[PDB]
Amino acid sequence: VRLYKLAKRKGRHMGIGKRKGTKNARTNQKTLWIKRQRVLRRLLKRLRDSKKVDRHLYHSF
Amino acid sequence: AQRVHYRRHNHYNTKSNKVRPVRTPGGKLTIHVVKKKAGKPKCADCKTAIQGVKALRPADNYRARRKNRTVARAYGGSICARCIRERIMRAFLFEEQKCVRQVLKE
Amino acid sequence: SRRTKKVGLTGKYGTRYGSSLRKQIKKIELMQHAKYLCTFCGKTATKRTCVGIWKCKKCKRKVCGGAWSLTTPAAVAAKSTIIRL
């Protein structure tokens, strides 16, 4: 199973013939949205804190 | 994996029988009954939680020290500070209005 | 985008029950789930809690109102006659 996991890490057993659950069951779209949103919000907070963006510009973005 | 079993005669997961697995120094995984979480004491008027007071179940509250059952002010333990402030102003101002209503009479 | 042409909030009922029944329940669930104007605080934040009880999320103060709207026209007119005197 460790060898199989190394191969999967190289991306070796995940073709569309190896998938049994739906796209969302395999990778929740809600979780993907949440991760992206947290990433972008964190970046905006960093910029506004470091004063690289005005407060209004931060709010608009 | 080590599997556990109830130890406290209640073999149903009622709200008073929630459990928590711990690892013992003997290397085995046992189960401990957790105490029910107690609600916060609440203000007599606004019903919000009173701060400065612990939130213990009655048995634990009876054993708690007097310091963290009360708040050293006026009502302080039954009325929140905002409600107390409003009550002070209301008590003083309404008697003042009663007196001015008296003095206006003649 | 626009998710339903006309069914609105009644889309939760699918195809069940008649279209007239769904339309009638829409016309009053619209006002049951609305936010009304709290005259005590001036913020439009009073929502229905139970069938006749309406609570403002800001003042925390609650009033007795209609089953589906904060006020009912019958009681509105009734109060107005009293206030006239």
């Binding site: - | - | 029944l21 007795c64 209609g66 589906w68 009681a75």
Partner: protein, 247 residues
């Protein structure tokens, strides 16, 4: 035959009211000298839901006068009452929404709820959600007052009987179509074992005068006389008329 479903109701075994979570009987204040000769104000502290009924109930706190302390009363809330309001009850209470007054002290044309059909029975008429009675006449001699009840009947009540000014809240409830049998189930789960019904015409003759036959019909006139015995009063009881109304 056997005892029919209507007859089994009075035994009160499984047909007692489901009243486990009821908050208390809705009665207004017992008559006091303060109410009789002046006014007494109590403040409404909460507006709560009584599971059996649709009308909200106001918890009105009065200050006791025969001794130091407070007394809590469960009133049927009229529409417009709010927590923190001061309600005034008595002969000299002003005419405003929420106040309890003798019906002889109100001008003709006002709308009232919580009507005492006899003075002092602390509230017996006009209590379902959205209802209201109208004071339509006052006797010249006083001591009598004529009101229109929500059924439309005109009733004469002595002018010392009390009522709330206003309309009992939660009005318009009937307007919502109960969409489904489940909503009906939940509605009656907190009132009574009166639901589902089952038609007598779908029964067997042993258990209902409508039961039996090869075609599911009544077979005899469904208008039964007022004198019919308990197992017989099953159709349209003492119907003066029948069929769609025309006015």
């Amino acid at each position: 035959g056997r005892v029919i479903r209507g007859q089994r109701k009075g035994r009160g075994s499984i047909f007692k009211s489901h009243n486990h979570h009821r908050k208390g009987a809705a009665k207004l204040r017992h008559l006091d000298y303060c109410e009789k000769k002046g006014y007494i104000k109590g403040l409404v502290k909460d507006i709560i839901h009584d599971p059996g009924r649709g009308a909200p109930l106001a918890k009105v706190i009065f200050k006791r006068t025969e001794k130091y302390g407070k007394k809590e009363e469960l009133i049927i809330a009229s529409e417009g009452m709010f927590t923190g309001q001061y309600i005034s009850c008595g002969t000299k209470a002003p005419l405003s929404v929420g106040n309890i007054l003798p019906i002889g002290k109100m001008p003709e044309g006002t709308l009232i709820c919580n009507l005492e059909h006899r003075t002092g029975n602390r509230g017996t008429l006009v209590k379902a959600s959205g209802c209201y009675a109208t004071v339509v006449g006052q006797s010249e001699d006083g001591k009598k007052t004529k009101v229109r009840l929500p059924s439309g009947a005109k009733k004469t009540i002595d002018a010392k009987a009390r009522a709330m000014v206003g309309v009992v809240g939660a009005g318009g409830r009937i307007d919502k179509p109960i969409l489904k049998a489940g909503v009906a189930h939940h509605k009656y789960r907190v009132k009574r074992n009166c639901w589902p019904k089952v038609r007598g015409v779908a029964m067997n003759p042993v258990e209902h005068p409508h039961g039996g036959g090869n075609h599911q019909h009544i077979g005899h006139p469904s208008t039964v006389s007022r004198s019919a015995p308990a197992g017989q009063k099953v159709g349209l009881i003492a119907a003066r008329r029948t069929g769609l109304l025309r006015g």
